Design a protein around this ligand. Structure first.
Ligand SMILES: [Mg+2]
Ligand SMILES: [Zn+2]
Lengths: 27, 56, 687, 83, 225, 670, 237
């Protein structure tokens, strides 16, 4: 989630990660 | 290998080469000394039998 | 993927051979930092990779990595950006650990990475850092292959490097199944326009959109349409919203090429069986129904740009115009009034692109040509005909004309006064021979485009899409594709697990609202956090009929089918399902090429190699030594003389062919004599 | 032997064909010289007559002179010696 | 033996599709005849399709229309969805213009005499206030698929934009057999067949036509010898 | 050979222009050329004739062996790809991943002849290196054939001979009879039957049984019990070939093909193989061998054996913790434990699967892949090696069907990338070695029919049995066949079974086995008396010709490629560098001493290595041997070396290998 | 639809009753569309007469023994099976085969009633050891295609009469394949090859026309819904 135009794709997450993805271009 | 050092003392000996290998005829492009190259095949005589020449 | 790339070769870096093979290896410090999978499969393996996803950089040029420090049998929630060295100080177990819902754990004896990079069942008191998450050791592209933990790294890396070689189709549908990567990928991808400020839409266009910022202020967003990529692929941007809409900041507003509904899209979702059919699916041979072709499901846009300059010679200034030397009129039809062709005109290889001309100078004409002029009243026109013609194997309309003129104050390089660049596109249908591949490394060329009717098909008359060969599967260790296929069939079908008597046990810990599924709903799996096969089996048991009472597939993922050729059912049920696939940037036309005779050398006497020009194929050391092995000598001699160096002999043989007469004899090679002169001039008595 | 019919480029069976030449090689050279003879025949047909004989078997509609030579060979109507 | 020829029975399913079954049949034959008709119907049915159209504002497939959201090629795929039946074989032409903000539906089209769409609800495009439309259409009877012919091969003007054609009145086919095959040798088949017209004609309409073409084929080998 | 019409269109431009100006279609050549630019469809028409019967060449570099190119009959084809016959793919080692190829074109009549005879497709079937065919059927067609030849016990209406209530109810007078039956829902293809044949040569036994004189299949008549599958299979073959009635394994196929080539003419062979390919695809379609995850069973009792070996390793780890064994001790112990676990697991896995599993059935037929690939698929993967090369004591305990963990996958990556790195290095060294070799022997050609020498070597020839039989050596075909006796095989100190001057293939060899003789002075290149190269006689049959080679051959190069080709597959001194240094004539690392005279040994070992000396039998100087590393080991043979062991004059002292030079200086050339 | 090209039929005469057929060109690809169809047709389209179940004196339940002769029961059976003999009678015709003494029984040895017409009477069937006499009755009728040996119509009709198969197809063997003649000018039309071999009863030529008529009789069903429908016309011959 956490995205405005996120089309609903259900996933099989058995876990829950604390952190989300970083800014890939920050490199 | 070591084309320079090979060639140099080769010419020093002034060894002429007989052109009888095959790589020779390769790089010179003249017909190879092998396969269809030898004289027994490359100098074949061929023509119609004069029997059939009677036919034609 | 090009960005976030890692390489040690370069200035300061080691050159290729100077490095030992060991640097190519995968040192255990690499874990979670450099994805060990993604790397070029050519002769640079181990030399270049990329970053793990959640990695991050030291100000000192190191990999500062987050970690979940655990304390007191309880994982904290403080991310810890760690380098590798300090990591050796410490004790890190795995994210996939039976945490007691609280940081507390379940069993004492736990896997953990050792300072030597080693693993043991640590008693569950000793660790001080837990993994931030699964897949912390994955690359970006690696992050985008479901079931990845079921197949070998070999085909894995193969599909990985291939997946960057995808080609943007014109329709750009999204896959039914995926990961969590497909959206974040695009939102960093950039080329999909993102909502800057939250707001209500103002007005759209096919080229831009007027946006109403929430307080007064507004803005447009110029869609990039038909922008030529660095590889001839189109770069359209279509808007995905309405002028009466309202969105929020950082939100998608228009997909890019390979983007569908905001997330990535690298192909289509296709129903396939796996039988060996007619041998046409022999050794990666890949068959195709015409249905996609006539449905344009595989349709590429290509943008080839051509450019030519306006130099100035000693003979004067180069010229561009409809005025030409000896030439037809119809060939001078679709030009503009002043040389160059007209926008929107169809073209074909060899056709004229731009009418350009320069003086050639003066030479005594042949008496013959002079005679033709006399009988024909034809002038000299010493200015030489130097126009622009389309090279071989090219067609399609010309979109836009880019024109530059020194007279226009267009800054141009010296010895130049006018520049023009041209844009032709050709809507390439898919065609046989082209290379496709799933997301598993499982790949291959297009075997044969078969019509729709002559096709194995369902009991519902629904024809199959394609067919792959089972025999490539085992020895390649790529069951993940089978997994994907089963999953995709389940996804297209939709289910509704009857949780009437509690829950079927496999569904017990399964997340809710998976208990049914609308057909053709989209889903995804984390790489290491994917569905189990038992879960999939319980799903496949629940496969609600499509329209009629229709359980097309068994509980085993197969089904009975009909040969559109034979008429009969096949003797067995067959694996089938929906797979997502890509199209590679190795089209047939990019590779197909032959030649008889073209522009000879300048240094040597030799008609130019290189498929950019004609070019052709070099018959060197491997099949020479070979021909000698065969014993056939004359063919080799002909190749190495009259196709290689005999200046006179070349035109001689050409004449002889034109006249229908026995071949002349092979003359002396040219490079031979050249080497001879060289040896001479080396102060060497030669004879 | 009773096996099958050949087809086009494989006609006639080289299995049979080698049965009269000593080696494949002399066969090849034999054929090539005859074929050049044939081509010279056609080239000289426009001009005056010469001892250039052949073909003997009725040549096909559009047949390679090589092919014609081969077929006459299997017909066994020639004569040759090594070099 | 069985002294009777079979019988062609009918079952209506819907307008756009219905069922057919026939018997008595010979054992080990129904699949044969069924794939026969399937291979037939899927391709050998004369249809009628748009050929290639033109609009004033455009020069080629790879441009835009002022005012619309969609583009040329988007409209291309949309129109490729279209359905229409001709009556004659000479190339007739329909047209379409439009103005103001709005949707473009299939019903929007001005058709010439003899032509008729069969799903006016087919969305085409949407426009704005500046949204302005004109278009001419090239349509013709045919059979099967053709790729778009080259306009250079033709002589038409640069506004022309060739489009592939799929003369498929048929939508989808399938069936199943009925192995009577009792243990008395009083055995026979029964083809549980289904048809799916794509809004152009009725299943029987396409079916009898196909059978006529088949009779064309067989008689060639029937009595010519 | 397939061909993109567009391509060849550009190819024969000179030919086509000539032939068309021959027609009244282009006034000058220039008209022809621009017309080619215009492609007026009659251009395609004359293109047809000009393409008619003109050979071509086809190249997939890099080439290793002689078949890197051949000659194909072109034929215009739609599309823009090179349509290739299936069977040549194994020759080119050319998958359909998208590898390109090159296509050359001969011009002279002489070049055309060279192609049309030598470089032809059909003229090249067998291994020029190893005599066996190369267009032999494979993975998919082989699959179909295996399905076709297997018999289904308890099958659809089998031949069930049981009177008293009904006939035997499985008999069929005609194959066509059975055809019609199974076309009805009557007969499985693999149900056993008893039909009577009149059109196929029965086996030698029964055929001689009924006849003895002439079992000739067009008109003879006779019964047999098989399945219709084997029926049709034998139907494919030429008439003269007798019946088979077996389940065609790939090996069986190869043997059949070898027989055919060795006895029949080529063109029959090619046609036969083609029909084979065709029907093979036909039935591979029907085999229905596909792969669902439900097709992949796992070891149902795996976990308990897992636990057994785990308890073992646990005790081992505890005892290492004791310090009773050091680090490497417990390492190797774990290595052994997990290897044993792997072995038992593969045992249970192999026994567990039913036989109809296509997953197994592939390797079962021997189409491809080994059982280890199976175990990796389902069950447990086991050990992943140190990227250095050592083994990781973890190890993997799952198969792909279970899916790995992060750590497991990471571990497997080590050996994965290591192997893929080695892949290029090995093929690189291969070409280097090849260049060395062929540059060595570039000028070795037959020049003489016979050197007429009388030197020649004798052969072990299927060693005697101690219980008493001529138990066949394994490595005889690679040695005995295509050889020329200079001697004459007498029999029983009597009649000569076989004399000087024969080719020494199957039947005579078999007769020699019947005779009971295991030594044969055969000619060899080593004894080819010719000065300038070799004689035809001492060379023997060509592996590819099947007959005695002509005198125009440079066999040296063929042998060169013969060696160089397999070098790619040489998967590791114990490998490729071993081979090199052998050809290098170097003093190997494992230089083991060799005897210099017979006698017992003055075997003796100093500190930290061995210190031995020869017991001379002349006698004289006990040949002393001093730096005998304790890491070295006494050569075991006959029992391992022991002190006072009477040895020979050239017996290798230690294990390993001394240089070729000293073995020369001791026991000379032969 | 205008045919735009007209396929053709040139039968090939192979050995006497093994004639061959080829046809082209084709709308790619009708070969699979129709050749297989016609195949199964001729396999199961034309009537034919054949033995139903013979009865033989003496032997009661031992289905394997025959005194006075050499061949066993089943050899007799199979030899009976390949008897080309016709009749115009849509009924169950019975028959007789009778002889004593040694010698051999063959095809023509039978007593033919009305309607029966053996087409290979000079065909050996059975041998007569030493003075042995046989009197066997035969049950032939006619039908289509080919039948298995049907089980007992009754539970047990008669101990003597014993069932057999019925090769009601006068056709014997059928095969074919598709081709791609003239792929550029004709744009890949197709060429059918047809291998038929049948008994001496009729010519494969004639059987071809017969089955073709039968099939078109079938497809008249298909056409007889809207004959006023656009069909792909071939034009005249
Ligand atoms: Mg490859
Ligand atoms: Zn010798």
């Amino acid at each position: 989630n956490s995205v405005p135009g996120a089309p609903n794709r259900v996933s099989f997450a058995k876990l829950r990660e604390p952190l989300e993805v970083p800014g890939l271009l920050d490199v | 290998q070591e084309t320079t050092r090979v060639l140099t003392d080769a010419a020093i000996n002034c060894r002429s080469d007989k052109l009888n290998g095959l790589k020779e005829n390769v790089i010179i492009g003249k017909l190879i000394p092998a396969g269809t190259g030898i004289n027994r095949y490359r100098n074949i005589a061929v023509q119609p039998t004069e029997e059939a020449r009677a036919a034609a | 993927t090009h960005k976030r790339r890692l390489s040690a070769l370069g200035p300061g870096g080691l050159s290729r051979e100077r490095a030992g093979l060991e640097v190519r290896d995968v040192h255990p410090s690499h874990y979670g930092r450099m994805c060990p999978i993604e790397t070029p499969e050519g002769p640079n393996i181990g030399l270049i990779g990329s970053l793990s996803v959640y990695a991050r950089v030291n100000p000192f040029g190191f990999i500062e990595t987050p970690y979940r420090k655990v304390v007191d049998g309880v994982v904290s929630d403080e991310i810890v950006y760690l380098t590798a060295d300090e990591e050796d100080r410490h004790v890190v177990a795995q994210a996939n650990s039976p945490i007691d819902a609280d940081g507390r754990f379940v069993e004492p004896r736990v896997l953990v990475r050792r300072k030597a990079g080693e693993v043991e069942y640590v008693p569950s008191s000793e660790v001080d850092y837990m993994d931030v998450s699964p897949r912390q050791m994955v690359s970006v592209a690696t992050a985008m292959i479901p079931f990845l933990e079921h197949d070998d790294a070999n085909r894995a890396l193969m599909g990985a490097n291939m997946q960057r070689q995808a080609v943007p189709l014109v329709r750009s549908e999204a896959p039914l199944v995926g990961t969590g990567m497909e959206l974040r990928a695009a939102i960093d991808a950039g080329d999909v326009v993102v909502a800057e400020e939250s707001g209500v839409i103002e007005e759209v266009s096919a080229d831009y959109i007027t946006v109403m910022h929430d307080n007064g202020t507004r803005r447009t967003y110029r869609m990039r349409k038909f922008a030529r990529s660095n590889h001839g692929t189109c770069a359209n941007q279509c808007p995905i919203v309405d002028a009466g809409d309202r969105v929020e900041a950082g939100q998608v507003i228009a997909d890019g090429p390979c983007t569908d509904d905001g997330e990535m899209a690298l192909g289509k979702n296709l129903l396939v069986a796996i039988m060996p059919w007619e041998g046409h699916n022999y050794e990666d041979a890949i068959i195709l129904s015409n249905r996609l072709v006539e449905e344009d499901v595989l349709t590429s846009i290509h943008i080839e740009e051509h450019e030519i300059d306006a130099r100035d010679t000693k003979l004067g200034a180069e010229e561009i115009t409809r005025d030409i030397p000896n030439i037809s009129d119809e060939v001078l039809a679709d030009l503009d009034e002043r040389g160059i062709v007209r926008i929107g005109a169809e073209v074909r290889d060899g056709d004229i692109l731009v009418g350009k001309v320069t003086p050639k100078g003066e030479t005594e004409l042949t008496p013959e040509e002079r005679l033709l002029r006399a009988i024909f009243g034809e002038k000299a026109r010493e200015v030489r005909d130097t126009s622009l013609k389309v090279p071989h194997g090219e067609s399609g309309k010309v979109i836009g004309i880019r024109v530059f003129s020194r007279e226009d104050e267009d800054e141009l390089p010296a010895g130049v006064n006018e520049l023009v660049r041209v844009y032709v596109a050709q809507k390439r249908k898919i065609s046989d021979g082209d290379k496709l591949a799933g997301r598993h490394g499982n790949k291959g060329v297009i075997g044969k485009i078969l019509p729709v009717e002559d096709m194995p098909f369902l009991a519902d008359g629904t024809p199959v899409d394609i067919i792959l060969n089972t025999h490539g599967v085992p020895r390649r260790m790529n069951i993940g594709q089978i997994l994907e296929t089963h999953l995709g069939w389940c996804a297209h079908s939709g289910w509704k697990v009857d949780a009437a008597k509690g829950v079927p046990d496999w569904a017990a810990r399964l997340p809710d609202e998976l208990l049914e599924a609308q057909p053709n709903a989209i889903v995804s799996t984390p790489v290491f956090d994917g569905a189990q096969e038992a879960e999939l089996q319980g799903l496949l048991s629940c496969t609600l009929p499509n329209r009629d009472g229709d359980v097309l597939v068994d509980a085993d993922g197969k089904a009975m089918l009909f040969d559109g050729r034979s008429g009969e059912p096949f003797p067995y049920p067959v694996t089938v399902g929906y797979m997502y696939i890509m199209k590679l940037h190795h089209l047939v036309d990019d590779k197909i090429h032959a030649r008889s005779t073209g522009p000879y050398s300048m240094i040597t006497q030799q008609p130019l190699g290189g498929k950019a020009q004609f070019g052709g194929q070099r018959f060197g050391e491997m099949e020479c030594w070979a021909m000698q092995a065969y014993g056939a000598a004359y063919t080799l001699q002909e190749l190495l003389t009259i196709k290689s160096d005999d200046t006179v002999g070349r035109v001689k043989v050409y004449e002889a062919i034109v006249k229908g007469e026995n071949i002349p004899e092979p003359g002396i090679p040219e490079s031979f004599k050249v080497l001879l002169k060289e040896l001479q001039s080396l102060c060497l008595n030669v004879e | 032997g009773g096996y099958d019919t050949p087809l086009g480029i494989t006609n006639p069976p080289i299995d049979e064909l080698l049965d009269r030449v000593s080696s494949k090689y002399a066969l090849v050279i034999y054929a090539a010289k005859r074929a050049r003879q044939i081509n010279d025949y056609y080239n000289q047909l426009g001009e005056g007559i010469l001892e250039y004989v052949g073909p003997l078997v009725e040549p096909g509609l559009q047949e390679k002179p090589l092919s014609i030579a081969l077929r006459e060979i299997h017909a066994d109507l020639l004569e040759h010696t090594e070099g | 033996l069985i002294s009777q020829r079979p019988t062609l029975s009918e079952d209506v399913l819907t307008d756009n599709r219905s069922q057919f079954v026939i018997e008595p049949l010979e054992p080990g034959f129904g699949y044969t005849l069924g794939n026969s008709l399937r291979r037939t119907l899927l391709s050998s049915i004369p249809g009628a399709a748009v050929t290639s159209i033109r609009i004033d504002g455009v020069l080629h497939e790879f441009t835009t229309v002022p005012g619309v959201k969609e583009d040329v090629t988007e409209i291309i795929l949309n129109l490729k969805s279209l359905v229409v039946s001709s009556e004659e074989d000479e190339p007739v032409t329909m047209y379409l213009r439009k103005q103001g903000p709005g949707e473009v539906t299939a019903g929007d089209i001005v058709p010439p005499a003899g032509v008729t769409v069969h799903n006016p609800g087919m969305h085409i495009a949407t426009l704005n206030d500046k949204g302005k439309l004109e278009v001419e259409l090239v349509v013709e009877r045919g059979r099967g698929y053709v790729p778009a012919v080259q306009n250079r091969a033709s002589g038409a003007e640069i506004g022309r934009i060739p489009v592939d054609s799929i003369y498929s009145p048929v939508l989808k086919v399938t069936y199943k057999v009925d192995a009577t095959r009792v243990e008395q040798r009083t055995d026979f088949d029964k083809l549980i067949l289904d048809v799916e017209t794509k809004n152009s004609i009725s299943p029987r309409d396409a079916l009898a036509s196909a059978g006529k073409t088949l009779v064309e084929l067989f008689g060639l080998a029937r009595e010519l010898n | 050979c397939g061909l993109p019409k567009l391509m060849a269109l550009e190819l024969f431009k000179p030919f086509v222009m000539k032939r068309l100006v021959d027609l009244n279609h282009a006034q000058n050549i220039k008209s022809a050329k621009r017309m080619v630019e215009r492609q007026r469809p009659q251009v395609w028409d004359v293109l047809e004739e000009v393409i008619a019967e003109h050979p071509v060449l086809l190249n997939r570099a890099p080439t290793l062996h002689r078949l890197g190119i051949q000659a194909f009959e072109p034929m215009l084809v739609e599309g823009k790809a090179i349509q290739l016959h299936p069977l040549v793919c194994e020759a080119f080692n050319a998958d359909f991943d998208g590898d390109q190829m090159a296509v050359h074109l001969p011009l002279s009549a002489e070049a055309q002849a060279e192609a049309r005879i030598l470089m032809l497709s059909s003229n090249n079937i067998l291994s020029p290196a190893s005599g066996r065919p190369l267009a032999m059927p494979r993975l998919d067609m082989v699959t179909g054939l295996y399905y076709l030849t297997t018999e289904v016990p308890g099958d659809t209406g089998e031949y069930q001979p049981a009177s008293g209530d009904h006939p035997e109810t499985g008999v069929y007078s005609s194959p066509a009879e059975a055809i019609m039956a199974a076309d009805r829902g009557v007969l499985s293809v693999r149900a056993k039957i008893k039909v009577r044949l009149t059109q196929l040569r029965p086996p030698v036994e029964i055929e001689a049984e009924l006849f003895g004189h002439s079992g000739w299949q067009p008109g003879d008549a006779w019964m047999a019990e098989t399945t219709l599958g084997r029926v049709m299979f034998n139907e494919l073959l030429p008439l003269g070939y007798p019946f088979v009635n077996k389940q065609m394994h790939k090996k069986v196929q190869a043997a059949i093909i070898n027989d055919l080539a060795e006895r029949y003419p080529m063109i029959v062979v090619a046609q036969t193989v083609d029909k084979l390919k065709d029907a093979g695809f036909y039935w591979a379609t029907r085999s229905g061998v596909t792969v669902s995850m439900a097709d992949v069973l796992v070891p149902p009792r795996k976990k308990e054996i897992l636990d057994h070996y785990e308890e073992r390793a646990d005790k081992v780890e505890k005892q290492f913790q004791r310090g009773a064994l050091n680090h490497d001790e417990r390492n190797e112990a774990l290595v052994e434990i997990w290897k044993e676990a792997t072995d038992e697991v593969g045992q249970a896995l192999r026994e567990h699967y039913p036989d109809d599993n296509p997953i197994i059935t592939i390797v079962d037929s021997g189409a491809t892949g080994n059982f280890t690939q199976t175990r990796t698929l389902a069950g447990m993967k086991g050990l992943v090696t140190n990227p250095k090369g050592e083994f990781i004591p973890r190890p993997v305990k799952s198969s792909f069907r279970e899916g790995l963990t992060v750590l497991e996958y990471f571990i497997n990556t080590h050996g994965a990338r290591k192997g893929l790195a080695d892949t290029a290095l090995r093929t690189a060294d291969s070409g280097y070695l090849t260049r060395r070799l062929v540059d060595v022997s570039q000028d070795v050609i037959v020049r003489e029919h016979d050197c007429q020498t009388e030197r020649g070597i004798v052969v072990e020839l299927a060693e005697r049995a101690p219980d008493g039989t001529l138990i066949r050596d394994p490595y005889i075909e690679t040695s005995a066949y295509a050889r020329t006796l200079g001697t004459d095989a007498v029999d029983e100190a009597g009649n000569v079974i076989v004399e000087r001057g024969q080719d020494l293939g199957d039947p005579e060899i078999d007769a020699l086995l019947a005779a009971g003789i295991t030594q044969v002075k055969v000619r060899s290149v080593l004894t080819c008396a010719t000065s300038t190269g070799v004689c035809a006689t001492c060379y023997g049959r060509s592996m590819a010709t099947g007959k005695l080679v002509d005198i125009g051959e440079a066999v040296g190069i063929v042998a060169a490629q013969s060696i160089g080709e397999p070098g790619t597959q040489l998967t590791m001194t114990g490998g490729l560098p071993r081979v090199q240094e052998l050809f290098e004539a170097r003093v190997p690392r494992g230089k083991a001493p060799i005897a210099d005279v017979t006698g017992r040994v003055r075997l003796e070992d100093g500190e930290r290595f061995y210190k031995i000396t020869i017991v001379p039998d002349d006698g004289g100087e006990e040949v002393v041997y001093d730096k005998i590393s304790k890491r070295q080991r006494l050569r075991v043979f006959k029992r391992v070396l022991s002190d006072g062991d009477h040895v020979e004059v050239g017996q290798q002292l230690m294990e390993g290998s001394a240089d070729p030079h000293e073995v020369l200086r001791v026991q000379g050339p032969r």
